[PDB]
Structure 1
Amino acid sequence: PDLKNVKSKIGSTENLKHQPGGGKVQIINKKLDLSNVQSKCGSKDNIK
């Protein structure tokens, strides 16, 4: 009558390494350039 300790069929065997982990995000942006500036509403020559 000894069955020889029969094993299960068929399980979550494909999940045994699984968690799963998460990816990443980082946003974060670049500064625009506003260095092209000069005023016009005054005098630079006729002041002299």
Structure 2
Amino acid sequence: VQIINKKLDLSNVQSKCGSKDNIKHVPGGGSVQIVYKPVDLSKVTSKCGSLGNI
């Protein structure tokens, strides 16, 4: 047996925001789950001369 795994991210990013998840990885049944009026009001501005590799 030989197992090889390779996961590669070589991103260039000017503005990056992580996720906004409310009720996540919550096992077991028999419950009341309410996500009530979640709101995103956010403002993102990105301004650039150049971004990739040269």
By the TM > 0.5 criterion, same fold? no
TM-score w.r.t. structure 1 length? 0.19
Q: Which protein is richer in helix relative to its size?
A: 1
TM-score w.r.t. structure 2 length? 0.18
Higher relative contact order (CA 8 A, sep 6+): 2
Rg (Cα) greater in structure: 1
